[PDB]
Design a protein around this ligand. Structure first.
Ligand SMILES: *C/C=C(C)/C=C/C=C(C)/C=C/C1=C(C)CCCC1(C)C
Ligand SMILES: CCCCCCCCCCCCCCCCCCCC
Ligand SMILES: CCCCCCCCCCCCCCCCCCCC
Ligand SMILES: CCCCCCCCCCCCCCCCCCCC
Ligand SMILES: CCCCCCCCCCCCCCCCCCCC
Ligand SMILES: CCCCCCCCCCCCCCCCCCCC
Ligand SMILES: CCCCCCCCCCCCCCCCCCCC
Ligand SMILES: CCCCCCCCCCCCCCCCCCCC
Ligand SMILES: CCCCCCCCCCCCCCCCCCCC
Ligand SMILES: CCCCCCCCCCCCCCCCCCCC
Ligand SMILES: CCCCCCCCCCCCCCCCCCCC
Ligand SMILES: CCCCCCCCCCCCCCCCCCCC
Ligand SMILES: CCCCCCCCCCCCCCCCCCCC
Ligand SMILES: CCCCCCCCCCCCCCCCCCCC
Ligand code: NA
Length: 269
């Protein structure tokens, strides 16, 4: 029995991490929060560039950046605090005098950010036949549920793969519903805007679809080559944390930038 849970800790306690793996992950997580702070300033500075009626979107972007910056900063500190060099072996191992790697930071970020990200498109596009309040409530419920059930799942990642995957499947149910509602919102948003605006919404959809699907990918990452597999290792920890960071930048900053551009193109008409 290996007291330690979560996958980063398990690897850290048994295998350890190479200098490369440890340093790379550290730098990736740092770039994570660096990009959010630059984003925060961007959304603040450019708020004036869009008409009053759209500005709640820029605002929500900014607030997402605040939470993303704070919690990803915490996550990065959590990484370097949690693993420590052994001279004998020449790898980084779980430090028992540290606090242990904790996914809580990222998952809290998700609980806060997912509702706002879904919400903020409703202040740029106009629905047609759907009700603002119906779409909102559906986003908020399914979003909360998606993150909550995921978080439950993630506890069993090492200890009970069955629970890990089942909770993850439930989570994916809510995910699918979100995709379905977002697609409706984007299709309705395309009616009665310039072709320029339609083109940007097409790109938002693609970005949204790819970026949000990275998260379940990273969730599953360690297991995507079986238990004997090359990913079931520091390389899976590396890839998971890399993909989470690519997702965060794309789902928050690039998403936000695209919505801003759409808002500007809408005023032009
Ligand atoms: C800015 C952060 C965002 C947009 C986070 C999004 C997170 C997800 C879409 C998570 C989805 C998950 C599943 C669909 C299954 C596995 C558990 C999750 C929470 C990773
Ligand atoms: C016309 C749209 C212009 C796009 C500008 C977007 C700028 C976003 C700034 C955040 C990314 C900066 C990354 C810095 C990391 C170090
Ligand atoms: C008026 C537009 C100003 C754009 C500045 C972008 C700031 C980048 C953050 C670093
Ligand atoms: C208007 C376009 C603003 C460009 C912002 C460039 C971001 C550079 C981030 C480095 C800090
Ligand atoms: C465009 C008008 C902005 C109103 C913000 C209402 C959102 C409240 C969220 C609770
Ligand atoms: C709504 C934006 C406020 C950000 C709250 C996020 C909590 C910060 C915790 C930092 C890490 C401890
Ligand atoms: C303004 C949109 C509603 C989301 C608020 C943040 C949710 C808190 C999660 C705990
Ligand atoms: C459903 C997601 C809720 C996440 C709550 C976990 C918050 C933990 C904050 C970091 C833990 C530090 C110890
Ligand atoms: C998509 C329908 C999924 C049904 C299962 C609902 C389970 C609720 C999760 C409990 C959270 C505590
Ligand atoms: C065909 C149009 C491609 C531009 C849309 C955005 C591309 C997806 C971004 C992937 C995020 C990683
Ligand atoms: C033509 C504009 C397309 C905007 C999508 C940008 C996404 C970049 C992905 C890397
Ligand atoms: C169907 C949308 C395509 C998104 C592909 C990204 C998901 C793969 C997970 C990466 C690891
Ligand atoms: C909704 C489930 C998304 C997981 C995609 C990851 C599959 C990668 C295939 C290799
Ligand atoms: C005319 C449409 C232009 C939209 C381009 C949006 C590009 C977003 C740039 C933010 C990406 C930051 C990632 C930097 C990592 C280093
Ligand atoms: Na350390």
């Amino acid at each position: 029995t290996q007291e330690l849970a979560n996958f980063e800790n398990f690897i850290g306690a048994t295998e350890g991490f190479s200098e490369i793996a440890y340093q790379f992950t550290s730098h990736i997580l740092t770039l994570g929060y660096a990009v959010m702070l630059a984003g925060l300033l961007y959304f603040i500075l450019t708020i004036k560039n869009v008409d009053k009626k759209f500005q709640m979107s820029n605002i929500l972007s900014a607030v997402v950046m605040v939470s993303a910056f704070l919690l990803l900063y915490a996550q990065a500190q959590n990484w370097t605090s949690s693993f420590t060099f052994n001279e004998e072996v020449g790898r980084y191992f779980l430090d028992p005098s540290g606090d242990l790697f904790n996914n809580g930071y990222r998952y809290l970020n998700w609980l806060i950010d997912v509702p706002m990200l879904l919400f903020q498109i409703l202040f740029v596009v106009s629905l047609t036949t759907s009700k603002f309040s119906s779409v909102r409530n559906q986003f908020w419920f399914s979003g909360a549920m998606m993150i909550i059930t995921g978080y439950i799942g993630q506890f069993y990642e090492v200890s009970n793969l069955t629970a890990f995957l089942v909770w993850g499947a439930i989570s994916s149910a809510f995910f699918f519903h979100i995709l379905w509602v977002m697609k409706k919102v984007i299709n309705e948003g395309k009616e009665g805007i310039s072709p320029a605006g339609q083109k940007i919404l097409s790109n938002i959809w693609i970005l949204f679809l790819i970026s949000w699907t990275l998260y379940p990918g990273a969730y599953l990452m360690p297991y995507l080559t079986g238990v004997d597999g090359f990913l079931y290792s520091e390389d899976g920890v590396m890839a998971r944390q890399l993909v989470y960071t690519i997702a965060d930048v794309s789902s928050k900053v690039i998403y936000g930038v695209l919505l801003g551009n759409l808002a500007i193109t809408l005023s032009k008409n």
